């Protein structure tokens, strides 16, 4: 009836062998993830084609909880697939596999949420998605772009299934120890005792001296065999050294600075082995083979799923460039509009008065579109995601041209697994109407008004009101294309927590709509979740309820544990969070701030009687970034410290300053409003500017790296909005007096000029 | 069509999961065999039931040949099944699996040839069979009896499939590098390069200093964690240490004496871990559960396959005891006869004049039978193999009694997979007739005359004559129960080898009948193989031809390799063969013999002019036990040295002495005939007696575990048959004068008394 473990694994190998990939066996050495295997890191290099699929036990010493945490294990199992070169339809096959595994595709809600992979220690990165199945992550999907610092040619697709979580979803369990391996034996009886014993060894009694010795031994031997033109033993030695290093980390004996050195050593080793493998396969002549490659106008690019901000930017740029070139080509036109959704970027130009110029220039226009991150699937053409189809129609006549190996056509595609999986259009004026037939609104905004109206209806259904900040709403708008709101509830005991945990967990991670009582504003045990497509309601409700309860169970343990020590003690661990090498840790930054806050307050004309209180805040600034809460929930910075101090008994204004030391966290964020918070935020930003400008890597494409890009902007907005006079030069000098790095007058002048330029941008 | 690799593995896991065993995965640690896995060595202990099946890559550093030897690899793959407790029909399921794997059962010739397992370093042993499929070993089958020095209760069955050899049999290939993994990728392109690189590492450039270090580290850590009541990490550490030791051995740096010490350390470690695991599971309360348990007279015991000498001894003892107790019970009877075949021990008593005494005494009689080696399947009842059925019939009346959990009945069983797989008997006088209907003869002589007559017919068919020594004939007689001779041939180039290699390889290992030309006595390219049952002829002919060609290819390469360095150079490696700790190596024994042979010859009244020649033989005695020829072919001791000396140019008598230094090799073997050979054999046996009696390990239960008595009996037979006078005391004293171990007069007196007793037994 309901599935087990060994049935799932068997079905996966059968399916993936049936498509064309040869099933192999898991290596006899320990890895942290399947990508580390010598069947993947080595084999994706070179022109030889490569298809393979295998199971792998993944061992992570850092996750030991003695088997009490209901879903975290030190040993899990992954199923890994490598396709090369890109067959051209990997997403068809992945969902077709999910079909063959017993997961019902149309009935469940399948969501491809953006996620880029990265791994410096292998020197690899790629672009792809994380697959959610009704709330839970179940798979990772990726296109490799560079491995061992060598740009891969041709590109390969990597697909990774996580099985314990999948089975926890299908069988409806809440703890790993109840999953059934096979008839009459549950996961517990087989693996719980091994879990306990290995967790004890990983956490307490393992020997570190011998493991340092083994790191030395294996590094030496890897170099030795790399000199002798044998790459397989070299890479094997590398894997042994890496796993020993992880066990080294679990004990807590990894130095705060040592990790960079370890990372450098291991990465250089792996890259050398990759280079040698490539040369060696070159000497052999490549046995496996080689690679070889007026009427309305509607223009649509159809790719796979794009990130939201990419959807917005691409729509704007494409529309503007098309209008421009139409003007330069002296062709008259009517109104021009743009539309977009995660899988399509469309622009409609009405009453266009032409075929030859359109044919000769459309590839140029589409090539002209630029994104921050681009990738190749075949050939050297770049785009955000691989293009699959182009709907380029003038009236009833199709425009022929070539680009990205895809010919323009009259075909489109609708919702996944419906009757309108594909269709065609003969008349341009039917375009927006034909998509009306597929159940997808192609404009933006329509979706926003629909979502908000339906959410209001459903929430009023139980006498509550939704909370809808702008950013959450826009993200949800561009995460779907056919909304369907659903109401759910959860157990009431969780309402005992502080309000911040509840709302932040509901919003930041899962994208659900919290609802407060229409009267008295208290939290209601309700939430609204936006499904996409023709789902069956109770399945989605069950899944999402289970997920929410799991996440709130996590908090309700961490929270009690974090009630035992007083916030005063957590400050000690701020030495474990890195700011910059020359400036020290977060603890050093806080110690610098605490000895400079009083002068900043004096220069701001703040009342002196608040000086003893504000300094008391300075002793506990950011003392939450080392609590288990903000470790799991990043968005709760400061506010949780406010509540802790309230329980700890500190003044409310101390808590408000600890909170507003964060504001603004980003563009558009509300700005600090209490005077101690203003002083703390000013001091923090001044220390950041003085330290980073005095120590280096300052301007990086004006993007963000090291938080200098938008921190600078905030410094001023705070000063302007709060109507407080300030002396920039004196405060900068006073801060530099506290910086451990010597700061000359030239650095101060540069900072003054930079602040002046940023203010000029603001003013 | 014709099978591949992954199809075989997938089909095996499917079949064995369908029967009731849960399929698991290969640990990420390196083993030499699946029995070493912590899923088998640990899990067979205790009363908790256990069924499991998994694949495992087996890594043996000692087998590196750089991929040139057609069937030997450093890395192979085994499929392992563990059943516990004994389900009761493990032999049905194993053949039912070979059926599901695509091997045709009735058409091929399936043979269960005796082979006992042993593994001291784990402290385990068992009893079982090696499965031959038309000439080639393909599977091992075993009942465990004691693991980790703790007598198991209840007993478990272990089945081990070897897959590369199976696939080499089905596809019809001669080298591993052509087996097809999957469509369009052969085994070569995947694994040949890994083979070359790992073979280079295993043989030349690996570091031994670091591996000694790691042995020390892991032994220390295993002790450390054994003290702390965590057995899983302890056993894992043990496995790492053992594999490192094997890589240590491949380089050749294992001392001739050190291996015993390493063996002791590792065995003690494993036993301690097993004991701790047992106590730990005892503390838990056993979650998995607990174990809980006148008319003719024809008496047949039916077990599984028995070894030959066991068949003979059991027939004799059962017949004698039954007749005795019939006499003691004052019951009259006619003629009494015995019959036996590998699966049945039957005794027929004619015209027996009783049911109550037979019922009350038959279990006593059957229990009274003794064997050198016994085992249990359920309960503590012992027998050579587990009993399955007892055919105990008096006339038309069945005799009811209970023993070994099996009730007496009227049922029997015929040839495997025939129409008469089962039948029943109502009339006693039909017994030998009814088996006539099943094709099985039952006399132990009828079979001999049938085999010899048919062999003569077939060999005369091509104008040749068979070679039939007695021992080979009797072994073949009791290896089958329904003979069918088959003629085959082989390639003629192999006739260029010396005659000894050809005949010895054909006889000692495969049990085939060599045929010589009727004229001139030259070897003919023919042989006769005795198939059993209703086989299809050409299948068997193809299989056996391929096997013979493979073995002769191996023989010719080794022969060519050994025909370079002189028979004198090979003497240096005799330090690598161990005789006893206190007496030294084989080289030391040969040096002792060479300095005492002249005095032995003088005491025998041998002509002095032959003294220079005989001593020249003493310089090269057993110079073959270190040549690859006798390393692979044990039965060629001495004779190959004779041929080498002939090629080397030595006198024929020197070679004859080198040959007869071995005679007799066993009971019934011919005795040395030339005087130098007589002197050499006498000197060798005298040195053996003086060394072993002077150093220890007296005749153990009279079975000669190291030699001494069958050895001495050989000495006295040599002295008597050759009509040579001899002085035992003086020769013993002279030999003791050469032994590095101090030998007192008491030792000499004990040896003299022992020789006198053995002569008394002979005379």
B91 inside 8 A of chain A by CB: no
Q: Given B28, B198, B230, which is nearest A233 (Cβ)?
A: B198
**Residues pairing with B394 in the sheet:** B297, B397
Contacts with A230 from chain B: Cβ below 8 Å: 197, 200-201, 205
CA angle A189, A194, A200 (to 5 degrees): 135
Which of the residues B181, B188, B232 would you substitute to probe the A interface, choosing the one with the greatest number of A C-beta atoms within 10 Å? B232
Question: B194 in contact with A at a CB cutoff of 8 Å?
Answer: yes
User: Which of B17, B27, B221 is opposite residue A210, by nearest beta carbon?
Assistant: B221
Residues of A in contact with B182 (CB under 8 A): 17, 22
Tokens of B28: 């990420």
Residues of A in contact with B235 (CB under 8 A): none
Contacts of B287 in chain A (CB under 8 A): 189
Name the 3-class secondary structure at B426. coil
d(CA A371, CA A380): 15
Does B200 contact A230 at a Cβ distance shorter than 8 Å?
Answer: yes
- The closest CB to that of A13, out of B10, B30, B182, belongs to B10
- To the nearest whole Å, the CA of A282 is away from the closest chain B CA by 13
Task: Say if residue A664 is preceded by a cis peptide, omega within 30 of 0.
Answer: yes
Check CB contact under 8 Å for A189 and B287: yes
Partner B contacted by A201 (CB < 8 A): yes
Residues 108-167 of B with CB under 8 A from A: none
Identify the DSSP state of B361.
H
Chain A residues within 8 A of B30 when measuring between CB atoms: 28-29
Residues of B in contact with A207 (CB under 8 A): 221, 224
How far apart (Å, rounded) are the C-alpha atoms in residues B54 and A26?
Answer: 12
Nominal resolution (angstroms): 3.6
Yes or no, beta carbons of A200 and B57 under 8 Å apart: no
Whether residues B23 and A31 touch (CB distance < 8 A) is answered with no
In Å, how far is A248's CA from the nearest CA of chain B?
15
Q: B223 in contact with A at a CB cutoff of 8 Å?
A: no
Burial class (CB in 10 A: 0-12, 13-18, 19+), A94: buried
Give SS3 for A286.
coil
Count the neighbouring beta carbons within 10 Å of the beta carbon of residue B541. Answer: 18
Distance (Å) from the C-alpha of residue A36 to the closest C-alpha of chain B? Answer: 14
**Does residue B43 belong to the interface with chain A, where contact is any CB pair within 8 Å?**
no
Q: Report CB contact under 8 Å: A197, B233.
A: yes
Asked whether the beta carbons of A686 and A731 are under 8 A apart, the reply is yes
Q: Taken in order B692, B695, B699, B705, is the CA torsion positive or negative?
A: negative
The experimental technique used to determine this model is: cryo-EM
Residue B393 contacts A where some CB pair is shorter than 8 Å: no
Cross-chain residue pair A217–B217, CB shorter than 8 Å? no
In terms of residues, how long is chain B?
Answer: 763
Residues from chain B that touch A232, judged by Cβ atoms under 8 A, are: 193-194, 197-198
Give A287-334 as a DSSP string: TT------EEEEEEEEES---HHHHHHHHHHHHHHHHHHHHHTT----
**Which residue of chain B comes nearest to A57, CA vs CA?**
B28
A231: its two tokens: 């790459």
Beta carbons of B202 and B74 less than 8 angstroms apart: yes
The number of beta carbons lying within 10 Å of the beta carbon of residue B695 is 17
| Inter-chain CB proximity A224 and B232 less than 8 Å | no
Does the CB of A444 have a partner CB in chain B at under 8 Å? no
Q: What is the DSSP string of A616-681?
A: HHHTTTTTTTTSHHHHH-GGGTTHHHHHHHHHHT--HHHHHHHHHTS--SSTT-----SHHHHHHH
Q: How far is CA B598 from CA B592, B658, B715, in A?
A: 12, 15, 18
Three-class secondary structure assignment of B480-529:
CCCEEEEEECCCHHHHHCCHHHHHHHHHHHCCCEEEEECCCCCEEEEEEE
How far is residue B85's CA from residue B47's CA, in Å, rounded to a whole number? 9
Q: Residue B579's CB: how many other CB atoms inside 10 A?
A: 20
CB contact under 8 A, B25 and A232: no
Check if A752 contacts B (Cβ < 8 Å): no
- Quote the minimal CA–CA distance from B197 to chain A in Å: 6
Q: Residue B284 in 3-state DSSP?
A: coil
Decide if A181 touches B, using CB distance below 8 A.
yes
Tell me whether residues A233 and B201 touch, CB distance under 8 A: yes
Q: How far is B141 from chain A (nearest CA, A)?
A: 25
- In chain B, residues 226-265 whose CB comes closer than 8 Å to chain A: 228, 230-233
Any CB–CB contact under 8 A between B205 and chain A?
yes
Contact A22 B6 (CB under 8 A): yes
Q: Which of residues 288-307 of A touch B (CB under 8 A)?
A: 288
**Could you give phi then psi for residue B297, rounded to 5 degrees?**
-115, 125
Two structure tokens written together for A202: 């990983």
- Interchain proximity B28–A23, CB inside 8 Å: no
Tell whether B204 is within 8 A of chain A (Cβ): no
Q: B277 to chain A nearest CA, in Å?
A: 11
Residues in chain A: 763
Chain A interface, mutation test: which of B39, B181, B233, most A Cβ atoms within 10 Å?
B233
| A59 interfaces chain B, CB cutoff of 8 Å | yes
Give the end-to-end CA distance of chain B in Å, rounded to a whole number: 67
Which is nearest to B638 in space by CA: B668, B688, B676, B607?
A: B676
Neighbours of A682 (CB within 10 A): 26
Kindly calculate the radius of gyration of chain A based on its CA atoms and give it in whole angstroms.
Answer: 29
Token reading at A258: 């040592």
Longest dimension (CA), chain B: 82
Q: Output the CA–CA distances (angstroms, integers) from residue B261 to A479, A542, A684, B254, B268, in the order listed.
A: 68, 63, 67, 11, 11
Cross-chain Cβ contact B233/A201 below 8 Å? yes
Can you spell out the DSSP letters for B728-752? HHHHHHHHHHH-SS---HHHHHHHH
Residue environment code for B218-230, b if the CB has 16+ CB neighbours within 10 A, otherwise e: bbebbebbbeeeb
Identity of the residue in B201, B221, B288 whose CB atom sits nearest the CB atom of A230: B201
Q: What is the Cα–Cα distance from A127 to A114, expressed in whole angstroms?
A: 9
The answer to whether A533 touches A109, Cβ cutoff 8 Å, is yes
Gap between the Cα atoms of B371 and B313, Å rounded: 8
| B288 neighbourhood in chain A, CB within 8 Å | 189
- Yes or no, beta carbons of A231 and B197 under 8 Å apart: yes
Q: Which residue from A minimizes the CA distance to B22?
A: A182
Q: DSSP of A23-43, one letter per residue? A: E----SS--SSGGGSTTTTTT
Three-state DSSP state, A739: coil
Domains present along chain A, CATH in parentheses:
5-205 (3.30.930.10), 209-283 (1.20.58.180), 295-437 (3.30.70), 446-564 (no CATH), 567-762 (1.10.3210)
Asked whether the beta carbons of residue B23 and residue A10 sit closer than 8 angstroms, the reply is yes
How many inter-chain contacts (A to B, CB under 8 Å) are there?
Answer: 103
Question: Which residues, numbered 4 to 23 in chain A, qualify as contacts with chain B under a Cβ-Cβ cut-off of 8 Å?
Answer: 6, 10, 13-14, 17, 22-23
Rounded-to-integer distance, Cα B87 and Cα B159, Å: 13
């Amino acid at each position: 009836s309901v599935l087990t473990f060994q049935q799932a694994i068997q079905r996966l190998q059968d399916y993936w062998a049936s498509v064309g990939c040869a099933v192999m066996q898991c290596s006899n050495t320990e890895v942290g993830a399947g990508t580390m295997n010598p069947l993947t890191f080595l084999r994706v290099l070179g022109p030889e084609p490569w298809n393979v699929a295998y199971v792998e036990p993944s061992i992570r010493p850092d996750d030991s909880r003695y088997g009490d945490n209901p879903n975290r294990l030190q040993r899990h199992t992954q199923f890994q697939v490598i396709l090369k070169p890109d067959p051209g339809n990997s997403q068809d096959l992945f969902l077709h596999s999910l079909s063959a595994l017993g997961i019902n595709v149309r009935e469940h809600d399948i969501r491809f949420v953006e996620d880029n992979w990265e791994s410096p220690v292998l020197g690899a990165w790629g672009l792809g998605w994380e697959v959610w199945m009704d709330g839970m992550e179940i798979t990772q999907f990726t296109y490799f772009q560079q491995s061992g610092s060598l740009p891969l040619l041709p590109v390969s697709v990597e697909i990774t299934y996580g099985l314990e979580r999948i089975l926890m979803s299908l069988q409806g369990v809440d703890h790993f120890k109840n999953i059934q391996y096979t008839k009459g034996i549950t996961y517990g009886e087989l693996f719980l005792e091994n879990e306990k014993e290995m967790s004890a060894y990983y956490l307490e009694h393992a020997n570190v001296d011998n493991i340092q010795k083994h790191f030395d031994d294996f590094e030496e031997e890897a170099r030795s065999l790399l000199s002798l033109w044998l790459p397989i033993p070299a890479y094997d030695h590398v894997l042994k050294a890496s796993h020993a290093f992880n066990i080294l980390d679990s004990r807590g004996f990894v130095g705060v600075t040592e990790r960079a050195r370890y990372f450098g050593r291991m990465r250089s080793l792996a890259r050398q082995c990759a280079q040698l493998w490539v040369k060696t396969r070159e000497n052999l002549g490549y046995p496996l083979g080689t690679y070889q490659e007026p009427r309305a106008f509607v223009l649509e690019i159809g790719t796979e799923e794009l990130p939201p901000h990419d959807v917005i930017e691409a729509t704007k740029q494409l529309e503007k460039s098309l209008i421009q070139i139409l003007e330069k080509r002296r062709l008259s036109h009517g109104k021009v509009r743009s539309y977009g959704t995660p899988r399509r970027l469309a622009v409609v130009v009405e009453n266009l008065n032409a075929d030859e110029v359109l044919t000769e220039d459309l590839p140029t226009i589409i090539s002209g579109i630029s994104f921050p991150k681009s990738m190749r699937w075949n050939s050297n053409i770049v785009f955000s995601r691989p293009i699959r189809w182009i709907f380029a129609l003038h009236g009833d006549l199709i425009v022929p041209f070539c680009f990205a190996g895809i010919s323009s056509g009259n075909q489109s595609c609708g919702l996944r697994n419906s009757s309108l999986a594909n269709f065609k259009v003969e008349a341009a004026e039917l375009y927006l109407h034909t998509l009306e037939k597929a159940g997808i609104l192609i404009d933006m905004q329509e979706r926003k008004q629909r979502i908000l109206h339906d959410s209001s209806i459903l929430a009023e259904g139980v006498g509550g009101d939704i909370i809808a900040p702008d950013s959450l709403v826009q993200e949800v708008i561009n995460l779907v294309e056919a909304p369907m709101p659903i109401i759910g509830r959860y157990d009431v005991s969780f309402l005992a927590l502080p309000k911040d945990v509840l709302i932040t967990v509901m919003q930041k991670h899962q994208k659900y709509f919290p609802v407060t009582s229409k009267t008295m504003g208290n939290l209601l045990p309700c939430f609204i979740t936006v499904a996409n497509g023709a789902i069956k309601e109770e399945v989605v409700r069950k899944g999402n309820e289970a997920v929410l309860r799991a996440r709130y169970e996590d908090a309700k343990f961490f929270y009690k544990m974090d009630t035992q020590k007083k916030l005063s003690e957590f400050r000690d661990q701020l030495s474990s969070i890195l700011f910059h090498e020359r400036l020290g840790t977060m603890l050093d930054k806080m110690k610098r701030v605490e000895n400079t806050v009083a002068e900043v307050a004096l220069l701001l004309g703040i009342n002196e009687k608040m000086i003893p209180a504000i300094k008391d805040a300075a002793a506990l600034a950011m003392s939450d970034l080392a609590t288990n809460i903000v470790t799991e929930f990043t968005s709760l910075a400061g506010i949780m410290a406010r509540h802790y101090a309230l329980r700890d008994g500190l003044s409310e204004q101390i808590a408000e300053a600890l909170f507003e030391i964060t504001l603004p966290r980003f563009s558009g964020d509300v700005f600090p409003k209490t005077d101690p918070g203003i002083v703390l935020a000013v001091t923090d930003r001044l220390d950041s500017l003085v330290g980073l400008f005095g120590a280096g890597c300052q301007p990086s494409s004006t993007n963000d790296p090291f938080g200098l890009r938008r921190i600078s902007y905030g410094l001023v907005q705070i000063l302007v909005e709060n109507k407080k006079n300030f002396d920039l030069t004196k405060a900068l000098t006073l801060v530099a007096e506290e910086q451990p790095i010597t700061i000359d007058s030239g650095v101060i002048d540069e900072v003054v000029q930079f602040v002046t330029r940023r203010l000029e941008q603001l003013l």
